[PDB]
Each structure stands twice: as C-alpha cells, then as structure tokens.
Design a protein around this ligand. Sequence first.
Ligand SMILES: O=C(O)CNC(=O)C(=O)O
Ligand SMILES: [Mg+2]
Ligand code: NI
Ligand SMILES: [Zn+2]
Length: 331
Amino acid sequence: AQNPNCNIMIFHPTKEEFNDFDKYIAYMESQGAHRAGLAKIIPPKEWKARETYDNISEILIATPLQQVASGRAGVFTQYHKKKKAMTVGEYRHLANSKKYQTPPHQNFEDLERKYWKNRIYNSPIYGADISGSLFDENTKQWNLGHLGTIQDLLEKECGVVIEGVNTPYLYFGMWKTTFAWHTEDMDLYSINYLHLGEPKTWYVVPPEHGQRLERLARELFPGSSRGCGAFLRHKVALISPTVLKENGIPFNRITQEAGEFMVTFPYGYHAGFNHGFNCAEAINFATPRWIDYGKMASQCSCGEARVTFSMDAFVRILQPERYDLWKRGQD
Ligand SMILES: O=C(O)CNC(=O)C(=O)O
Ligand SMILES: [Mg+2]
Ligand code: NI
Ligand SMILES: [Zn+2]
C-alpha cells in the first residue's frame, strides 16, 4: 500500500504532465496521495493562472462575513455575521489596517502559535464563497473554471443525466480568517488555488480516520451533536492541533503559498486559517473513485447546512432513501 502513514504529498508536475488533469489526479492516487486527505501541487515554472492581479480591486464582496468565535482557544465555534458590501480594494485596505493586519512573527510556526493562542479574541472578516474565477480564459491547464463537471462525471459513470451546474468560488481572506472542520458536500474532492497574497495553513485528517474526528467532535460539542447527527456539515467547529494530539486523532498540517494548488480528497476532513490578505479560488470535482464516497456521505437534515441547488440531484440519485428527509432540511 502506497503512503501507509498518510503523509501529505507534494507534487511537481512537468508542463507535459500538467495537460491532462484527470490523468494527473489518478497518478497522484497511484502514489497514495489520497490517503492523507490533502495534497499540494506546485505548477510547472512555465505555467501561470493569469498575466497579473493588478486589476482586481473592483470585484465586489457583496456579503463579507465577520467570524465571531465562542468557546476556548483550542475548542471553539464560529458564527458568521453579515457585514455591508465592499470592494476587494476596500477589503484589502481593511485587512492591512492596524486592527486586522498580521502581527510581527518569526516564521510560519510562530504565526501558527499566535493563531491558536489568540484567534478567539478577534473577529476577522472573510470574503468567502463568491461565485467567479480569476483564471484567464486562455489558461488551458488546471483552469478551475474549465474542469469537467461533476454532473458529467456522474453521467459518465452511472448513465443518468441530471440537472445542475458546477462553478468556482473566490475567497478573499485576511489574518485569522478561518475555515472550520469539514469534508466537502457529498464528500467530493476540492481543488484550491492560492492566486495571490499571504499563505493559508491547512490541517487534515486521513479519510480512513475521519470517524475518529467525528467522535471527538461529538464529545467536544455535545449540544451540537444532539441537535444534528452530521453537525460538522454546518462548518462552524474548530479544534486545535494541540487538542487533536491530546486526544490521539491522526492529522497532518501544511502551509500553502501563493501560486500553489491544494487538492482535498473524498472524506478528508480539513480546517485552516489565512496568514494575511489573500485570494484563493476553489471548486469541487469528482472522479470515478468518488462515487462510492458520495453514496455513503453523511447528511445534515436539521436545516442548518443549507446548500446549493446542484446537491439535490446527487442526493436524489446516490442516496434515494435519504432524499425525502434531506430535502425537508433544505425546505
Ligand atoms: O480556503 C478556504 O477558506 C476553504 N477552502 C476549502 O475548504 C477547500 O478548498 O476545500
Ligand atoms: Mg476589478
Ligand atoms: Ni473544503
Ligand atoms: Zn444539521
């Protein structure tokens, strides 16, 4: 078995290997990358997403989210308070303000220490989940707006034509902006490209150990657990690396820098934070290997997790028994 310790692997494809996305994902899996839940892909040196980022300031962040924490430093939840719209240029100024900027630090490790120590005492503002793309239309390789769609994958594998579309999302982050512990909708893959700015630190649990994380989460968030049998789908809970180590949960960590891709694999729980002003782009995708994960994915039916139009068909076709109850949660 390749990569039996479930380490995060880093890949350096050549320009020739960067042509065929599906084939490279399958290569990474042949080397055991999926066992970690997360892989880094450094693009060939010849590649670029677009020519410059000089003209992005007029993108609108229609609903910036203030991430308010409750709990203790290592075990907290966050809720998202909606703020007034602002442009990317306005957001970048805010991120760089004395109130919100990255503190002085020695290195990524020092910054990670400061994040875990102090995150709960601040409420950073995240421009998340903005439909759109920063890839130039002429970028032919690993262009997240030109991937094969999950609907077409399901059709190719299973023969059923379904409604739905699949488009990317932009994330504009600042210091301490945070992504809570989650897997993807329907335990899909995700791919994330850090277009610009400061890094993003990731934590991930190997898919084979996901249920260990879930069991800890039920212990640590006991009211949430009673409210919903899949409450990590709410994307609100954080658990520090110190706490994970104290409870014997297997995980790994890595920092993504501008110009790098990360891939999350089916049922790979992940969480993380941004180091400073940045912009990432991400999208879900599927492969043949995903189908069995989609069929087994947990679902939130309590009403909190509220998701896209396109998840309907996935539940309906892969999880027909669950469909009725899950749809009640959506309506
Ligand atoms: O970058 C973020 O805030 C969150 N991204 C992801 O969870 C992902 O790409 O799967
Ligand atoms: Mg603009
Ligand atoms: Ni994710
Ligand atoms: Zn729920």
